[PDB]
A paper describes a structure:
Phosphorylated arginine residues (pArg) serve as a degradation signal that is recognized by the ClpC:ClpP (ClpCP) protease, a quasi-proteasomal particle critical for microbial protein quality control, stress tolerance, and pathogenicity (Trentini et al., 2016). ClpC carries out its quality control function by acting as an ATP-driven unfoldase that selects certain client proteins and translocates them into the protease compartment formed by ClpP. The ClpC protomer contains an amino-terminal domain (ClpCNTD), two AAA (ATPases associated with diverse cellular activities) domains termed D1 and D2, and a coiled coil (M domain) inserted into D1. In the active ClpC hexamer, the D1 and D2 domains form two stacked ATPase rings that power substrate unfolding and translocation.
Of note, the mycobacterial [name] is targeted by a range of cyclic peptides that deregulate the ClpC1P1P2 complex. These antibiotics bind to the ClpC1NTD substrate receptor domain and thus have a pArg-like targeting function. The best characterized ClpC1NTD-directed antibiotic is [name] (Vasudevan et al., 2013), which binds to a hydrophobic pocket located in a remote position relative to the pArg-binding sites. The [name] binding pocket is highly conserved in [name] unfoldases, but is absent in ClpC proteins from gram-positive bacteria, enabling selective targeting of the mycobacterial protease. Guided by structural data (Vasudevan et al., 2013), we prepared a series of [name]-like cyclic peptides and identified sCym-1 as a high affinity ClpC1NTD ligand (KD = 0.81 μM). A co-crystal structure obtained at 1.7 Å resolution confirmed that the sCym-1 mimetic adopts the same binding mode as the native [name] antibiotic. Moreover, the crystal structure revealed a possible linker attachment site to synthesize BacPROTAC-2, in which sCym-1 is linked to biotin. The respective alanine side chain does not contribute to the sCym-1:ClpC1NTD interface. When tested in our biochemical assay, the sCym-1-based degrader stimulated removal of the mSA model substrate to similar extents as its pArg counterpart, indicating that derivatives of the [name] antibiotic can be repurposed as BacPROTAC components. Importantly, these data also show that various ClpC1NTD binders can be exploited to develop chemical adaptors for targeted protein degradation.
Residue numbers in the entry:
A (entry chain A): 1 to 156
B (entry chain B): 1 to 7
The structure:
Amino acid sequence: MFERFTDRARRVVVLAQEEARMLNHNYIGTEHILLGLIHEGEGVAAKSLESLGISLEGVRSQVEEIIGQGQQAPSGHIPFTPRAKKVLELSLREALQLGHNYIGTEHILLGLIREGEGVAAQVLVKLGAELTRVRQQVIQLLSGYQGKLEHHHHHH
Amino acid sequence: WXAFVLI
C-alpha cells in the first residue's frame, strides 16, 4: 500500500528507520514513526499538531526521554514492530473512512493515535492530541491548503 | 508492505 503514500508520508517512514538506527534500536516502533514525522516536519500532520497548540520540539523530547537508547548498531533493514504495523494498518483505515484514496502524513498521525497503546499515542494524547480533535483539525487544514502542501504519489 | 522500508 506504500504506492498510495504521499511524498512526505513516504519520507516519514524512510526517516523513521533512520531515527531508530540513530538510537541503536533494531526495531521501528510507534515512537520512531513519530520521530520521523517530526523530522519531516512540514506536511499536514505536522501543521495540524502545531495548530492545536502542541510543540513539535516538546513531543520529540518527551518521546526521547521515554525510549532512551540501545547498545548495538542495527545493520540493514530495520523491521516495523507489531504495534507499528498496526499504525500503518490504521492509517489506511482512517484514510478510507475519510473518503480518501491516498495516505498522507495526516493519516499516519491519526493511525498513531488510533493505535492507542504505543509510546507515540501515549505522548500525543497527554499533550492534548486526542483523536477526534486531531481529525477535525486535519480536515480544516486539508481545506485551507487546497492540495498545495503535500503532493500525492506521481500526481498531477 | 507491511514489514520493512519499503515492503
